Design an enzyme around this catalytic site. Structure first.
Site, PDB file in Angstrom:
ATOM      1  N   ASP A  53      29.029  35.254  32.902  1.00 51.28           N
ATOM      2  CA  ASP A  53      30.132  34.305  32.759  1.00 51.28           C
ATOM      3  C   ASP A  53      30.111  33.681  31.359  1.00 51.28           C
ATOM      4  O   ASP A  53      29.151  33.014  30.974  1.00 51.28           O
ATOM      5  CB  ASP A  53      30.012  33.216  33.839  1.00 51.28           C
ATOM      6  CG  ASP A  53      31.231  32.309  33.943  1.00 51.28           C
ATOM      7  OD1 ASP A  53      32.021  32.237  32.979  1.00 51.28           O
ATOM      8  OD2 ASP A  53      31.390  31.661  35.000  1.00 51.28           O
ATOM      9  N   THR A  86      38.058  36.229  35.483  1.00 47.31           N
ATOM     10  CA  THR A  86      37.712  37.053  34.342  1.00 47.31           C
ATOM     11  C   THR A  86      37.895  36.154  33.124  1.00 47.31           C
ATOM     12  O   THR A  86      38.742  35.258  33.167  1.00 47.31           O
ATOM     13  CB  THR A  86      38.594  38.313  34.225  1.00 47.31           C
ATOM     14  OG1 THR A  86      39.969  37.943  34.086  1.00 47.31           O
ATOM     15  CG2 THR A  86      38.423  39.213  35.442  1.00 47.31           C
ATOM     16  N   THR A  87      37.160  36.332  32.041  1.00 45.70           N
ATOM     17  CA  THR A  87      37.401  35.433  30.918  1.00 45.70           C
ATOM     18  C   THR A  87      38.464  36.015  30.002  1.00 45.70           C
ATOM     19  O   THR A  87      38.222  36.949  29.249  1.00 45.70           O
ATOM     20  CB  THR A  87      36.116  35.153  30.110  1.00 45.70           C
ATOM     21  OG1 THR A  87      35.435  36.381  29.821  1.00 45.70           O
ATOM     22  CG2 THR A  87      35.188  34.217  30.870  1.00 45.70           C
ATOM     23  N   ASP A 355      32.479  31.040  41.633  1.00 39.88           N
ATOM     24  CA  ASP A 355      33.555  31.766  40.994  1.00 39.88           C
ATOM     25  C   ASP A 355      34.649  32.142  42.010  1.00 39.88           C
ATOM     26  O   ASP A 355      35.842  32.062  41.722  1.00 39.88           O
ATOM     27  CB  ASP A 355      32.958  33.065  40.448  1.00 39.88           C
ATOM     28  CG  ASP A 355      32.029  32.850  39.271  1.00 39.88           C
ATOM     29  OD1 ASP A 355      32.109  31.788  38.619  1.00 39.88           O
ATOM     30  OD2 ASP A 355      31.207  33.744  39.016  1.00 39.88           O
TER      31      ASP A 355
END
Lengths: 489, 493, 482, 339
Positions: A53, A86-87, A355
């Site tokens: 992350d 998702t980043t 998450d």
């Protein structure tokens, strides 16, 4: 003071450099083809740490003089009350800075360009609004609850081989809390001790404490007592506590601080279970669950106190002893609890449940999602290009620059797939133009395919937060007047 | 080797540098293309602060060793007498220092130069408040009620595409507010969908809060209660807090309770059965103005009701605003205090209206008090420049020298307005001066046009105090800098 | 460190530098349009101090190695016997040194040049020879006490719109200060209440303290007791004395307080030591030690002591005093920046006026004395012997700069002013001088500007007489360790 | 620098240099026009101090490294038995050193020259006879009591204008001092401290001179009258003695010539015009004739009345030879191990 004073083009540049450094590291992390990363650093780190992350690593370390740390700080607020998956929020924000080199050619003032943001609303709103993406999320829903976005959040992370199932459990938690806004009173713990499913669902809150070696193991029709002040002539304190306790039938005592020894002997004989230095975060959340109480001095018992009397007990579920609070009358707040196999992967499960939890609560209530794999982004690009021609004088410059920016996103997804993006970029464009919102980049396919079949959907919140935050930061530094001292601290 | 002492030319420079540093930052703030800025600090400073208003940021920080903090402090007295207008007072003070470079070649005497200020004593009395400009700003005014100054304050904000119409409305509110009890009585909200008109005027105060799902829909002959402290034998004491509330409440006929903070759960059940509407966590900004509106109250502990509370009694209800329902407070006895609700055209922020609310009436309280005005958009500025050229000639010798230099200073203001526009600044100066020379006061600088136009059609006008108070502000702290010429000695190298 | 070694040309130069540095700063200060200045230092100094009065700043600071401080120290002696009006003594002495460059050219005997100082007595005549000024100042003077020179000291100062009334008060202070009691015991303070008078005069010493709410209102045939040691036996011998008031410089013990009220004795808690030291001179004094102090060991004056509300706050007044050498004035005012500066003016006013009464002479201000003085001295250089004459003529042109400085600070053109100025003075009018408001020349007497005769005498005696030793010295001033 | 140790030609110089440095400050002290000179110092010194008398200021402080403080210390014992007149013992003793430059070129036994001091006894007796001594006195004396030598002691002092009057006052004090007793209070005007006590030590010199005038019964003509007469006679004397005696004789004699020159210059007239005329009058045989400084030429000293005590001239003559004599005989003042 510090007095680092910014001048015109040398002010803009610091923002520009911060954005490029972040984009290369975060880009490989995205979706199914997401990857774990390790870091070694100067000072007190002494070793390489690995966090899949992106948000967790950025807060831990503030490496250098240009300030990108504040931009970084904002992502956590997103993560606790929505967040991840998702980043991509940081990546999209960074790409808009490249165009500013083009902007100097325009050479008027940044603020005139700022008109793009009003139109960021009109160009983008059409984009999110190009539709399908979200099935509809009827409310609770029998199977659309998961096996979608939470699974993909887990996909970038290895634990997914058997943890896809864990993700499935998390949606159940969000459905029961729908209404009156969002998230409050959600917590998760993991226990050492293996099972194939790797989880146990508790209808109440999970706390890890015990009164002492002695005391009744199980309590029935339990009353809950919460004290703002600790238990810590002495016998008189003992006497007041016993007299009030018996009438209420008190089965459990929870106090957020140090507990005094004298009462402890009494609790065992009385049949009352007490908890030393109970965590405040569990208590406040618990209070919504039990209806709460006003915690004052020992005058506190009975009516000024409100306890929930369903079932409280300490249960050996495997190895480490835990205490189970169960039976929430309110129904508004619940927990979840997790089990494992006894692996490094299991501790990773703790990393991703959070998450999973945040995504679904927002996904259900917002009643919106977008198509992943760049489906939303290419379609957005097609709609925006015609828009620039449509707009008048001051409108027709800001919007046009914003529109070409969307083009890069399709390209980034195709390369991480491994196939040649040149062929990919307009073959993709033809499909979105046609009218299939469901169509998009298929990394597994190597070309373009049907995104909906894949099941990748992105929360509507992840997409709005990224686009607005992307250039607001760009416009604020260039403007900066009379800067004072230095360093975010 | 330390002392921190400096020679004639260098000593002048330390003051000179402070004026230039401040001017560039305040420069971006002025006019229609004004910009918002952020600051970072260490040592009892929490986080980045952004202030549109130039005065607020200068007050909060004593940044460095050069002298300018005292100059800054004075602007607040100005932001009491009238207010912000558009920040410009600081800019004019700064340009005074640039001529000083010329003064070394003046070749007469710096103290002699000081006599100009003496001249300025009767010069801030001449060019200032004794020129031509407009015929306006006495009480009420129908055509020139607005289509004036609200637009110029508003100009700095880009929303002026439709916002200028919004600014038209603002003076209607000011006329009703005129009376005894200066200012605090105005609230505004924005809406998410609407018409071309873009705004509506409501008879009463606008709020977006509700006690809870239960409670009576409407109250009449309403009594209003405001409490500083939240609603939030001891077991029995809760029953007693509940008892005190109802006993005092019933005799009064209590129709509505407004509390600025968190409210305790026990009272909520009482209010519903009683037939009393209360508001949880109502913000303070609405409350202070509401108090002035009702007739006020003394907000203390539970003793607060009856005599210490003064309550207006027409109608309190939640009603009809096009798409969003809000609670309307109206029919107040004072009448001095009233609300322009507005609604949103629909642009990103549109929270703009909340900031513009404050903007609308503070300037206007002085408008009745001065019975005078000027034309904005630099109309007055070019006119004074053409007029001040004559004024320098009027005074012989020593008297003229300080005055003519001041006159060329006015030339820059037209240019700065042009600069934020994006149009070429040199072109703007020519066209501007001829119109003013002709004798038409209405003509001014039209930034969207890029040339000169009728100021009244856009609106922009300036209150008379904003133009007499500002020059005095310009001459502030600058005078302490150079009226006294003594810094001491030299010890070689 | 030893004695500093310098010889011939170089030695003279160090003296030369000290005079020029001081003159530029003092220059802006002179006259109605003088300037207020701020100085910053390090070590034992807090922030910024601003003094219009040149003498006050010089006494405080001895900044560096070059010679000048002994000259500076002397001005205080000058203040005791006049000193002030406006600062001008330092400026004239400094201009004496410029001529020394021309002396090397003479190349003979600099000591014979000293005989020019013999001529200084003539300067005492001639400098002030320039036409008649005033002649009375009999002593006390019911009407001639002020309303002239005091105003002039104040004119430079901003406070003159109402201050001129305050300056008038100051002569009364000087009249009680005449004779030889030394220059001591003068106390001044300002108050928050506002009035047209802007000041008050008290016949005694003012102190601001009270025993407590309880205790008698006033005392008569008062006995005053001062103790070095704190109160932290008293009644039995207190009664014997008849004790009316007790003043202690420090914390006071609560027990005696109940006793004083019943006895009929008023005491003062935490009285300031400086007031106490002056008071002892005033009442014949006493010797302060332990509680044994009362009776004969203690001497107390017996007029009357009482506490009186001024108007805004409570104060205590001590009056009478058998000895008579020390007295006090209590000031109050309108409440302005100008009121704070009242402190500035009283200190200046007491000294100016004190010598006004015993000087017997004054001079016309505004440069009147200086231009005429220049004219008379120019004729004499030719009449007197050669080398002594050379020193004397150069000195004469020095007077020319003062007319230039006064016109220049007013904003008028210095060149034009000099030409017109000289013709007026040359003609023979004592009264005619520089009118800064006018920008030309006018009658000084109408303005009411006059200078004490001795302010003029010691500006030049220091420039002259003492200057005999200046070339003679070789090695000057420093510190005074620990 | 690097450790000082001077020998022969430059070692001699350190004694030489000390004598010249002291002479410039003190030379201005002598003659009717002189310099008052004031000094201010650091460390327990408060203000500039004025002392006309050269001897006490030297006593008060030891300013620098070169040797001279001990030489300085000695002058005070002179003060106890006669003391002043004008400070000429330090300058004349220093005067002998300048001639030594000539001696290096001589290159023949400097030591032989030193024996001249022994022969200075012969010079001292020469000084007697030559001195030009008066009659008068008459104990008490109505008009010749002062306006003479005290005036000479004070002529040098700048304050002569006003002060010559109070110099006159001091002989009245000596008249009361006469009769069975050997050697009342007088108040001066001055600066402030210990250095002020310098005046007590400095004016010690003035009191004694006058006291001697009443019981000496002998005195000599002032204004330089004594010095020129003595000079003419001493030139003969070198010629009047055997060659060993004569060399120390003749050099001593020309020294007297400088005094006339210093006296005339301070007056305000050409210094050497005076020298010609002065010598001619003394040669003739008139002991009364001397240097008239206001005149700028020569005149009758007796009309002026200025006279010098026989003791001041008698003792100075004996003292000058003995003080100078010790310096040549003794080394350079250092050595003997441990520094």
């Amino acid at each position: 003071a510090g007095a680092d004073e910014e001048r015109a083009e040398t002010a803009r540049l610091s923002s520009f450099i911060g954005a490029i450094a972040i984009g290369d590291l975060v880009k490989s992390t995205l979706g199914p083809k997401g990857m774990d990363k390790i870091l070694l650093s100067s000072g007190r780190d002494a070793s390489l740490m690995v966090t899949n992350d992106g948000a967790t690593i950025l807060k831990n370390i503030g490496v250098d003089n240009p300030a990108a740390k504040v931009l970084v700080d904002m992502s956590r607020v997103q993560d606790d009350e929505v967040g991840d998956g998702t980043t991509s929020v940081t990546v999209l924000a960074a790409e808009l800075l490249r165009e500013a080199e083009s902007l100097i050619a325009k050479k008027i003032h940044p603020q005139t360009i700022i008109a793009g943001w009003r139109e960021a609303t009109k160009a983008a709103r059409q984009a999110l609004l190009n539709s399908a993406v979200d099935h509809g999320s009827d409310e609770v829903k029998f199977r659309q609850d998961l096996m979608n976005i939470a699974g993909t959040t887990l996909s970038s992370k290895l634990l997914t081989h058997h943890k896809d199932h864990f993700t499935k459990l998390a949606v159940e938690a969000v459905l029961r809390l729908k209404g009156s806004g969002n998230l409050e009173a959600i917590h998760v713990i993991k226990k050492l001790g293996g099972s194939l499913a790797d989880s146990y669902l508790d209808e109440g809150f999970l706390l890890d404490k015990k009164i002492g070696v002695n005391q009744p193991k199980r309590i029935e029709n339990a009353k809950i007592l919460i004290a703002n002040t600790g238990m810590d002539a002495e016998k008189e304190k003992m006497k007041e506590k016993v007299e009030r306790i018996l009438k209420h039938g008190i089965n459990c005592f929870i106090n957020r601080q140090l507990i005094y020894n004298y009462p402890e002997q009494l609790f065992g004989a009385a049949g009352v279970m007490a908890i030393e230095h109970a965590d405040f975060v569990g208590v406040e959340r618990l209070a919504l669950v039990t209806g709460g109480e006003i915690a004052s001095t020992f005058d506190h018992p009975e009516l000024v106190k409100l306890g929930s009397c369903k079932l409280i007990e300490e249960v050996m579920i495997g190895e480490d002893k835990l205490i189970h609070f169960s039976g929430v009358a309110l129904g508004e707040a619940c927990t979840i609890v997790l089990r494992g196999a006894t692996q490094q992967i299991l501790d990773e499960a703790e990393r991703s449940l959070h998450d999973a939890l945040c995504v679904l609560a927002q996904t259900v209530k917002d009643s919106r999602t977008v198509y992943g794999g760049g489906c939303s982004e290419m379609l957005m690009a097609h709609a925006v290009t015609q828009l620039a021609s449509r707009t008048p004088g001051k409108e027709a410059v800001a919007m046009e620059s914003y529109a070409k920016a969307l083009r890069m996103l399709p390209t980034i997804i195709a390369d991480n797939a491994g196939y040649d993006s040149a062929d990919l970029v307009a073959q993709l464009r033809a499909a979105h133009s046609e009218g299939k919102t469901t169509a998009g980049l298929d990394m597994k396919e190597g070309t373009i395919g049907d995104m909906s079949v894949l099941g990748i959907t992105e929360s509507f919140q992840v997409k709005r937060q990224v686009l607005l935050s992307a250039a607001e930061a760009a416009e604020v530094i260039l403007r900066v007047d009379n800067i004072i001292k230095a360093a975010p601290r």
